[PDB]
Amino acid sequence: MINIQEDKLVSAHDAEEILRFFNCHDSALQQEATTLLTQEAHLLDIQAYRAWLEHCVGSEVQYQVISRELRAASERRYKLNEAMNVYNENFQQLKVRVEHQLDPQNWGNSPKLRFTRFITNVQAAMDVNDKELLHIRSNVILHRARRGNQVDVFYAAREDKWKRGEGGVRKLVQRFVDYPERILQTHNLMVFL
Amino acid sequence: MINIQEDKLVSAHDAEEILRFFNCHDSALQQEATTLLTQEAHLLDIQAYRAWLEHCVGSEVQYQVISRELRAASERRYKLNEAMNVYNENFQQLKVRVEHQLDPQNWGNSPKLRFTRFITNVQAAMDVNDKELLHIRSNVILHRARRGNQVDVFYAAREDKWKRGEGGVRKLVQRFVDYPERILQTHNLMVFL
Amino acid sequence: MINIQEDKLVSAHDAEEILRFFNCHDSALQQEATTLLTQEAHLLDIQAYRAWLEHCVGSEVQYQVISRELRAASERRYKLNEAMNVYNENFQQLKVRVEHQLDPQNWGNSPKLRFTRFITNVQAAMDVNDKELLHIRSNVILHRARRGNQVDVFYAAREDKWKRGEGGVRKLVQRFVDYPERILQTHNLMVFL
Amino acid sequence: MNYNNKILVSESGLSQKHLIHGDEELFQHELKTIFARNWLFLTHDSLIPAPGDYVTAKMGIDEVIVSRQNDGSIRAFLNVCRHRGKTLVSVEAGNAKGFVCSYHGWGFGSNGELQSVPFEKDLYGESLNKKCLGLKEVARVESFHGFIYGCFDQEAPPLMDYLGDAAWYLEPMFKHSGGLELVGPPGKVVIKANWKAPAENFVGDAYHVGWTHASSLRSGESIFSSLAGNAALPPEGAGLQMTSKYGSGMGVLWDGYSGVHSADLVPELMAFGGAKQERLNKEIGDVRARIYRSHLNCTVFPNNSMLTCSGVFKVWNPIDANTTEVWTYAIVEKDMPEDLKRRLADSVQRTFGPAGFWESDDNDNMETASQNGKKYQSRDSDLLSNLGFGEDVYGDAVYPGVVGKSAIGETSYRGFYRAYQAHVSSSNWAEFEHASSTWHTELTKTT
Amino acid sequence: MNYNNKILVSESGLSQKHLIHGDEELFQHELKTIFARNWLFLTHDSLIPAPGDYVTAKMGIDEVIVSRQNDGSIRAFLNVCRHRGKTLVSVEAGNAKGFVCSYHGWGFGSNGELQSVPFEKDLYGESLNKKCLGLKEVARVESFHGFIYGCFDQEAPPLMDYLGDAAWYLEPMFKHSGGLELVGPPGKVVIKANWKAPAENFVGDAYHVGWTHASSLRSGESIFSSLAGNAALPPEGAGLQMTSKYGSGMGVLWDGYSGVHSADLVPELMAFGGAKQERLNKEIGDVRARIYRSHLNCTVFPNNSMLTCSGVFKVWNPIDANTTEVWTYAIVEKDMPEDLKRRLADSVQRTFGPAGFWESDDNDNMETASQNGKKYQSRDSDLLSNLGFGEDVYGDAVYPGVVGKSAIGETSYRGFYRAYQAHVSSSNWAEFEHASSTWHTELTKTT
Amino acid sequence: MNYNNKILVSESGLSQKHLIHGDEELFQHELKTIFARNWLFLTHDSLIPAPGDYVTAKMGIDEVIVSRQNDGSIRAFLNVCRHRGKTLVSVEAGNAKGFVCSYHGWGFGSNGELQSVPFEKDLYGESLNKKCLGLKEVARVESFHGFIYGCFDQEAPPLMDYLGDAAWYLEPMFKHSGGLELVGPPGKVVIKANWKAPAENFVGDAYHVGWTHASSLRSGESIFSSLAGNAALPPEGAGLQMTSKYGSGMGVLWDGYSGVHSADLVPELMAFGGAKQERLNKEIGDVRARIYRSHLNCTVFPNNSMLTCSGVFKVWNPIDANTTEVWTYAIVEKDMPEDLKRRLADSVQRTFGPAGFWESDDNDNMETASQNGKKYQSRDSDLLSNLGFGEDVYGDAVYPGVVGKSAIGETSYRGFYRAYQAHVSSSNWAEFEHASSTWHTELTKTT
Ligand SMILES: O=C(O)Cc1c[nH]c2ccccc12
Ligand SMILES: O=C(O)Cc1c[nH]c2ccccc12
Ligand SMILES: O=C(O)Cc1c[nH]c2ccccc12
Ligand code: FES
Ligand code: FES
Ligand code: FES
Ligand SMILES: [Fe+3]
Ligand SMILES: [Fe+3]
Ligand SMILES: [Fe+3]
């Protein structure tokens, strides 16, 4: 589809991802993906973080959100680290964060937070080389409300890889988000996108 | 799925609701639900409030939105009314509100308001005990614009019960929303979520 | 369904559009429409504007977004131009705008913008008289982020007509948006809704 | 602006400069001369009935913790830690014997005393004087039949004297009915209006009801439905207006016990009120018993308002000159059946809560009137409140206060703004009293 | 800041303190010395052509109702009720014989008179003096060939004298073409810029076109395409700049009748303009007839701008020092074919409207230049406007005003800021006139 | 407010008026007396190592371009065009020999010189004095072992003298370890707190760690896990606090080389630090070698903070009194293996970055403490910083500076606010020095 010499604003990475969902459409895989993500969002919204780990997250997971430095469109010399990791978690690290949420001395969680997630634009395709790896792309709006008048809304595109694990349950083995706002205006990014 | 002694942030109510959609998936019921909610949102968006009542709302409806008082996560003694009702309407009360919207002397409706609704995360399951009762859960972003520069955006999760009534049309018999923001920053909550 | 003498807030245009999607539901056409719009949103989000033109936009396209003057609900005498065109583009005009985006001297595009689109509430129906014309209605939330702390979010309902063209690919031949906010608070409307 | 000299409210309260709804400097001045000086609504006994029960509340832009003490009294404290100033309590209600700060762990008792400091012996030794480090306490906390008010100024009049002539009108419902309770939690909504706009609206505006609420009246078919679209003046004698020395005021609409409530509650309410009224005749006299079951639209100066019988109870919490946080409770009579109480509570929120269809009619009125006060050509313009002027009386044999013997007028505005001007140009209560020595004479001048 | 003494604009208008784009105190001062004093654009005859037609408009931060009277005149009134100050009209355009306030129902006529008060006889009796309670009226409303301007200051010069030397340049298009009409409704967009940034940009900035709009020029292939990426200086003699006593100014680019419009309109426009120009030669002379079909980038002081031939018409409505509400209309010649008019209107919005691809090039220029005026190290810095200085003339035999006989320069900036400084340090029109007695001498000093 | 006379910080720095976290006038004053006067962190050599490399940075509310020169030096310039004041550079980092303004195309070199002006000969002729039109340059740019700081005030002490006694504590890690590098890009997040709240938190607050971070300690099982829920005081002798003349200060926690990092990095870190420490014993002595591998929580006055060993590096960029833009980098030792460096960088962001689970514990502390400073009844209240007072020493034989020989206390707060008060009441560096002549005597007074 895309030629990135002509479509001058498109990254090689973005063009690669689009080719993945264009070639073959299987609306049944798309339905499994929609259900998978809707249930994950439901668990996260009710703050069932243990259930999320057990049911949605694979032992080999990489859960990653980056913030990319603003560079000139024509830049071509400066070659230092392009991005930092807001998240770059293995399962054990996710577990630490989940423990942190559930701890009765996490003062920030009293009174209880309120989360509402909106998942849209779901696409799904099997990897060509590993026939057990499911690629799922989806976009999220995440609304977090706390303490009367604090309201923070997050927006992101998610590049996921999901794979059948324990008991044949499909679980997340990679999530990649390149967060679209460079300077956060939401107090922090302490939410599972 | 969930054990609320381990998943310490999950309410009994929230854990009950998740069990409802997990056990059985029927993507055809899910499609009826998506169509039902999309058409309801369309009618509300064009302000066809009479049509909404006639086509979407059952005579036995309870239409309820609560605002829950912020209490300590560890609270266990204070036992006064936990929530107030922003809405708690029977069909007759909905009718009063619809009449209020359509009245030519409702000055607030001139110039005409603009509504845009975004419905996501639809889940559907039949009640186990009443086989004619459909449970539908969905999330809404509701955008309301008026008078040049007033813009208010609402976010909520909806727990619905829908049932076939007149002429076999499925209609809303209960909507429950626990509104996620304690202090409203939208001037009012005078919108049908 | 709707009688606009009873449903006093409903426009003739809005009532006509609802009749279009109510009479016949074909959830397979609805699935083609969902895929069509998801792929279009994906291309626009990665700023593959050339690909968007080639793959999504028909040669006979009218791409139109209006801003309607606020008038009294009871107004009935004043008959001057009701709306202006924020967009009213033919294919050639869209091409000019796409060239403008890709030009290396478009200073506003450095550093690279970030777009995330959320498409919801998809409905689809074939025109009764032209059996090759697909009507698709959908709502969009469009998030645009640039230069560290600039964040603009757009909300709209889209009335589309899509038709098979080159190689049997369905392409957009008309988009109509009546933009819901009269005074824009997003710096400009320089985004493809 | 020199607040000693500047005339913001003209003589007799006949007019006000529009800028008072928009000026941020004046807002800051109000924090000192209005909110730090006067009685402000906190809570009700029914919301903190047991030792250890507490709620948070605003007093002006300050937040306080209001706590039931072991001895049955209530004390209130700034919600601010004495160490590095973090907000102590982040919830709205609960029960506790104390409050621990989550920053460094300082523990204060419900009585505001600094009770524990983490590792005090190791770190502070004996050099920390904890008796000097108690939470900053609200000077005055008094009750009016279960309704609890606070005042930062030790020199304020007692709450009863402060209610002045308004107390006489409130007592049949607040006292002789057997007592009211406040049903929480309150609805909470930010509006883009000055706190004074809904304050003045509730204190004396029956004029707007027929027009502003034409649609709600017609739709709900409340007992006031007659007034809709301005189809009807209520009979000459349908009620009266009153005001008082310290600014509080109210309108009275005879016999309107079902109030704003839609037709589904009208027969029950009218039956219940009439029944109690018949018993009250023998106890407090026919006039007062009737007052009990008559609709009072009242503001308790400065920012607490209410509709008796309707059961609407409001706090207009100031945020800035064009921002107000509206708290909405229901008030019910204790001896109402529980099911009636619940439906009344719901109906109060249905009409005047966050999705209140009446409250929404008022929105654009309050917001635009307030925002116009910032516009350059309107700042020095005059808001008019002369309706009924020259016909007000004082010292009537039956109805106390400065009284307009007609249902619709601006008597209560004049009284509200007279007190407001008196405070704004005064440095303390002594000066307010000096500026208020001929208050009723000023309000009755053309009569 | 002492506005009598502080030099915000240096002699001859050569430089300005950067803080003028960011200082909120100065913004408030501008409300008084700029917007309450000068002529401000309201509407066009074409938008309110029939008795009863009205539109709302901003004058500074104030909102007014502008109404066609039965006698064919136009009067304008503050959009504020004389009772409790609610906004009267909530729509942007319509037709009506009057305006009723939705708060208490007061009815005002299109002529601003207080005409009805609900239940006036019962409530007010005869004591309400309605003739004193008319809407606050805009003192001065005048027309320049259908374009209607307003001024709160009764002492202002008539609009024609106020346009001064700029009027001569506008007349071929505004008057001798047979007249223009304004195509509404306007696009409306908030930008985070001071109103002065796009004002100065339109009054005299041809310099930026080739660079700021390199991409739009290249993409649309407009008649100015030559300048793209700074590939080309327009020939020596390609145009000129002018400015005037009361601040208005414009650039002239010879023969550019198709203006900013993309190639799809170029042949039609160039044919149409050339045709009218040939007729105009005989009526107004060759020079002026050519001016008619030459591109004028103009600001009418203080905040109305336009591009003739392109047909762009702008109102930079001030909100605060870093916020401006941009209104965008199209102007077309009345005797253009209707289909051409429609396509011209669309093209004006395509290039300069809310999604205007040219207007978007300018955004970051206006916003950051304005926001930098708040930054601590830039407040006391000097914005430079010295291009072309020492070569300006006055009283030329062919072209009136202070004139730079070159297409690109900053002559119009200097004239704009001279008038701006003169007003900011003056208390009234008499003082402005005193401060402007040697205006053209000051602008031509090194010449 | 008269900043010459008003006591915002009491003698010995024992207490501060709460309003300092909320007052916007004082914020504006700080722009002049704090940020335009003192050394501010810009970048590190590792981020601009080659000629032409540049980054943008904030200095106070101003933005600067920081550029590696061809000669190996670094110069910094206001990111503002000398023509009409548009922001020059819109990216955060890159490499270039110059910067062209996108408004009218003026080209400046990396050395800030105005190098090209479009069509200069045709338009300006020779009358444009380009040597006077270079970008406004940051007066002072100095390096502390690769860490680059800037100062707008030419009269400031050199950076080394400015670090005063704090330099001695930083050197083992910054210098003797073989050098650090800064890992970018930084995370960037806006918090609703005054810049002073996290400044004071990092300069001297070990007290809060056990309580504020009870959950993070317990969850991550970092080497400080002992302190969780206030389960443990660290042994008497577990560390110390220091402060200095120009405001910089730090806490020292003995041997805590793995710092805040969760258990997955603890063994590697403790092994690596201990190994280097053994080598350092012979070079710099046992005390300093130990300091190298001890956790330092430091603020470099006014708004740069860090946790050595943990590797957290912070810039608290001021926006207004209740708004701060937090920049978060990682610092690593150059001779660490690359894989360790990468995991350390990730762990720094995991704990203290935009989704840092420790940084989130602190949020409500910083925000509410700051916002309470605007509340009417708290403005004139006193924030307390008396912990450890009367036991501080100066001129100790082993540890330089004003030193508290205990791990937990408020010695560094007192030193931080003494310097802060000294600047706020001073007009220049000479006056600060005069107000600081007995600085250590004032800090040690009851001892
Ligand atoms: O509708 C309101 O704003 C409350 C109110 C103020 N005066 C009144 C008189 C009668 C009924 C309600 C009100
Ligand atoms: O592009 C603009 O900003 C409008 C403008 C100002 N001077 C001009 C000269 C020629 C064409 C357009 C403009
Ligand atoms: O947790 C923080 O806020 C950073 C910090 C300040 N003082 C400290 C002492 C030990 C460890 C971390 C910190
Ligand atoms: S701020 Fe409350 S204990 Fe320190
Ligand atoms: S405010 Fe307009 S009628 Fe009262
Ligand atoms: S503002 Fe930079 S070149 Fe003109
Ligand atoms: Fe009302
Ligand atoms: Fe431009
Ligand atoms: Fe901390």
Side-chain angles (χ1 to χ4, degrees), chain D residues 16 18 21 197 200-201 205 207-208 211-212 230-233 236 364-366 368-369 372 374-379 381-388 408 410 413 417, chain E residues 28 31-33 35-36 58 61-63 78-88 100-106 117-120 122-124 127-128 133 136 152:
Chain D
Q16 303 76 45
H18 203 163
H21 291 335
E200 74 174 44
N201 185 73
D205 200 332
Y207 194 8
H208 83 294
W211 199 241
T212 282
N230 272 337
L233 75 275
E236 289 136 56
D364 299 317
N365 297 340
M366 308 290 96
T368 64
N372 286 331
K374 288 184 171 297
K375 294 188 173 310
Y376 180 85
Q377 294 286 338
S378 292
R379 290 165 194 178
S381 297
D382 308 295
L383 308 176
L384 279 156
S385 49
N386 67 345
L387 176 49
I408 285 162
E410 295 167 334
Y413 284 71
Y417 287 113
Chain E
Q28 293 297 315
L31 296 179
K32 176 175 74 176
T33 61
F35 303 99
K58 307 301 289 301
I61 69 179
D62 298 277
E63 187 168 74
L78 242 55
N79 189 13
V80 181
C81 188
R82 292 299 314 270
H83 188 208
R84 305 297 306 169
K86 189 202 171 265
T87 295
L88 199 58
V100 173
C101 184
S102 60
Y103 198 168
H104 309 87
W106 284 23
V117 164
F119 310 94
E120 184 185 7
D122 292 318
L123 301 160
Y124 288 95
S127 65
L128 188 68
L133 296 182
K136 179 169 179 176
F152 288 116

Side-chain angles (χ1 to χ4, degrees), chain F residues 47 67 134 246 320:
Chain F
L47 266 18
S67 171
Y246 296 97
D320 55 45

Side-chain angles (χ1 to χ4, degrees), chain D residues 201 208 212-213 352 358 362:
Chain D
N201 185 73
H208 83 294
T212 282
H213 296 302
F352 281 85
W358 293 59
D362 287 313

Side-chain angles (χ1 to χ4, degrees), chain A residues 70 75-78 80-81 84-85 88-89 93 97 100 103 105 107 146 182 184 187-190, chain F residues 46-47 92 94-95 184 186 188-190 211 215-216 218-219 264 346 349-350 354-355 360-361 364 367:
Chain A
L70 276 358
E75 185 58 60
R76 71 289 90 184
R77 287 179 291 268
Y78 197 80
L80 259 19
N81 295 128
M84 52 76 60
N85 289 308
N88 185 21
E89 312 302 79
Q93 285 149 356
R97 288 184 177 272
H100 174 246
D103 193 310
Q105 301 175 314
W107 317 116
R146 72 193 288 266
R182 178 66 179 121
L184 297 187
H187 302 265
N188 60 49
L189 235 174
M190 280 275 288
Chain F
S46 65
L47 266 18
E92 291 173 330
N95 176 279
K188 293 186 176 184
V189 185
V190 175
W211 199 241
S215 57
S216 301
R218 181 169 310 111
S219 297
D264 55 18
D346 279 357
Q349 302 294 353
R350 175 173 304 118
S360 68
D361 295 337
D364 299 317
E367 296 192 336

Side-chain angles (χ1 to χ4, degrees), chain F residues 317-335:
Chain F
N317 280 318
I319 297 299
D320 55 45
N322 278 180
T323 308
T324 293
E325 187 176 312
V326 179
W327 292 23
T328 308
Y329 300 81
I331 39 188
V332 305
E333 294 162 48
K334 298 206 299 185
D335 56 15

Side-chain angles (χ1 to χ4, degrees), chain D residues 255-273:
Chain D
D255 301 322
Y257 185 81
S258 61
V260 299
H261 299 296
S262 299
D264 55 18
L265 278 164
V266 165
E268 284 188 26
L269 288 188
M270 298 293 286
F272 183 94

